[PDB]
Amino acid sequence: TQKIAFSATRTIVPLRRDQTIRFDHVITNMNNNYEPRSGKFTCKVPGLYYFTYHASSRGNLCVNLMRGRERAQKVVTFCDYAYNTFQVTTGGMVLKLEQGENVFLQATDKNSLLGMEGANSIFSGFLLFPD
Template identity: 30%
Template sequence: MLWNQKKNIQNYRNVIFTKASSSICDVVVKLLIPVGQVAFSASLLESGSGTLGPINAHTTLVFKHVVSNIGKAYSPHTGIFTAPVRGAYHFEFYIVAHGGSHASAAVLVKNGEHIFIAAERQTNGYGTAANGATLLLEAGDVVFLRLWQNNVIYDNENHHSSFSGHLLFPM
């Protein structure tokens, strides 16, 4: 049954391409071919434990322990998510502060614009902060987390500090 459906779609596309203008073909083919699924989750450190910062400048966080990267829109080399299609995307992030003299703060950034921040100050023990947002992105827009200047972020083998996002629906 599925093979017949695929064959019928292919035949339908062939008819469209031979009998319709290019712009109509593009619209119909987009309707027939589903948009790829997009989702990722990653934590800061690939292994071990450690604190990043303080650094005297805003710094892009690169989440290296990738649990999932469906659609390959997140780069574990740069820490940047690039929207493959126009749509509504949801992002969330969790950061851990390990007691000390510096706070922990991370900012969700879209195309260079600060969207939301999560921050925590813990003089001893562990403290956590989290935030999230749903954003309308155009294809090619970028989203990443930035460690706020003079702040720190901690992670270990339990993967406390994480960044995730997924396409809710294309538009």
């Protein structure tokens, strides 16, 4: 009965290229596999997971969705641009994960990311099937 699910928002400082994007405010964290201090989900139960985010922004934003166990690599990059305006963008991915593998979002030079009441950014994930 593996009940694994997290949702965390960001309330935080301008992000640097290659910096892990921390979502510091936990809404949900069943099984405690997301760590708000690091911004990383770490797989304890091998299986299939869905990851998803929604990011508020006031300019150009690209984010790398990362997977790995010490040296992570980008699976995909999502970009959504905005000229002198406010936007919300989204990305998602089904991933097979093994024990110890982390999943997280990583910043780029395109770093317009807002995290506030009234313009939230959220990172979520859940177990689909263990194995």
